[PDB]
Design a protein around this ligand. Sequence first.
Ligand SMILES: O=C(CCl)Nc1ccc(/N=N/c2ccc(S(=O)(=O)O)cc2)cc1S(=O)(=O)O
Ligand SMILES: O=C(CCl)Nc1ccc(/N=N/c2ccc(S(=O)(=O)O)cc2)cc1S(=O)(=O)O
Ligand SMILES: O=C(CCl)Nc1ccc(/N=N/c2ccc(S(=O)(=O)O)cc2)cc1S(=O)(=O)O
Ligand SMILES: O=C(CCl)Nc1ccc(/N=N/c2ccc(S(=O)(=O)O)cc2)cc1S(=O)(=O)O
Ligand SMILES: O=C(CCl)Nc1ccc(/N=N/c2ccc(S(=O)(=O)O)cc2)cc1S(=O)(=O)O
Length: 127
Amino acid sequence: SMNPPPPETSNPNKPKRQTNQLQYLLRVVLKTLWKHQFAWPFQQPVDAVKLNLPDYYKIIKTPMDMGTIKKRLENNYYWNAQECIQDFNTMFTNCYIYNKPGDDIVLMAEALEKLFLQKINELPTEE
Ligand SMILES: O=C(CCl)Nc1ccc(/N=N/c2ccc(S(=O)(=O)O)cc2)cc1S(=O)(=O)O
Ligand SMILES: O=C(CCl)Nc1ccc(/N=N/c2ccc(S(=O)(=O)O)cc2)cc1S(=O)(=O)O
Ligand SMILES: O=C(CCl)Nc1ccc(/N=N/c2ccc(S(=O)(=O)O)cc2)cc1S(=O)(=O)O
Ligand SMILES: O=C(CCl)Nc1ccc(/N=N/c2ccc(S(=O)(=O)O)cc2)cc1S(=O)(=O)O
Ligand SMILES: O=C(CCl)Nc1ccc(/N=N/c2ccc(S(=O)(=O)O)cc2)cc1S(=O)(=O)O
C-alpha cells in the first residue's frame, strides 16, 4: 500500500497575503487546539499504510489535516480566513464520512470542532 503525497504547504503559483484573521487562526492552532490529546489523530496526514486502511484514499479524495493547516498558516499560504476555515471543515467532514457515528475518532473530531467553532465565533474583523 501507498500514501498519496501530502497536501501542498507552499505554492508560488497561488496568491497569498498576511491578515490579522490568519494570524488569529495560527495562534488558535498553536495555543488552543494543538495541545489537546483529542488532537493527536489530526496532527498529520492519515498514514493509511501504518493504519492498515487500504480503503482510506479510495473513500477520501480530499484529505486534510491540522499539520498541513498549521504549516500553511506559518508559511502564509492562504489568501483569506475562508480558505483556512474550509480546510478545517474538510478535515472534519472527512472524519465524519469515513468513520461510523459514535466511533471514538468521531468523538475526538467533535471535541476539536466544538473548540474550533468557539474560536471562529470570535474571529476578529479583518484589518
Ligand atoms: O514553482 C512553480 C510555479 Cl512558479 N511550480 C509549481 C507551483 C505549484 C505547484 N503545486 N503543486 C501542488 C502539489 C500538490 C497539491 S495537492 O496534493 O492538491 O495539495 C497542490 C499543489 C507545483 C509546482 S511545480 O510542479 O513544482 O513546478
Ligand atoms: O476571510 C475573510 C476575510 Cl474578510 N473573512 C471571513 C472568513 C470566514 C468567515 N467565516 N465565519 C464563520 C462563522 C461561523 C460559521 S459556523 O459556526 O459553522 O456557522 C462558519 C464560518 C468570516 C469572515 S468575516 O466575517 O468576513 O470576517
Ligand atoms: O450508515 C450509517 C453510518 Cl456508517 N449508519 C449508522 C449510523 C449510526 C450508527 N450508530 N451510531 C451510534 C452512535 C453512538 C452510539 S452510543 O455511543 O452507544 O451512544 C451508538 C451508535 C450506526 C450506523 S450503521 O452501523 O452503519 O448502520
Ligand atoms: O457527527 C455525528 C456523527 Cl457523523 N454525530 C452523531 C450523530 C448521531 C449519532 N447517533 N447516535 C445514536 C445512538 C444510539 C442509537 S440507539 O441506541 O440505537 O437508539 C442510535 C443513534 C451519534 C453521533 S456521534 O456519536 O456524536 O458521532
Ligand atoms: O501519523 C500519521 C502519519 Cl502522517 N497518521 C495517522 C493518522 C491518524 C491516526 N489514527 N487515527 C485513528 C482512527 C480511529 C481511531 S478510533 O476510532 O478511536 O479507533 C483512533 C485513531 C494514526 C496515524 S499513525 O498512527 O501516525 O499512522
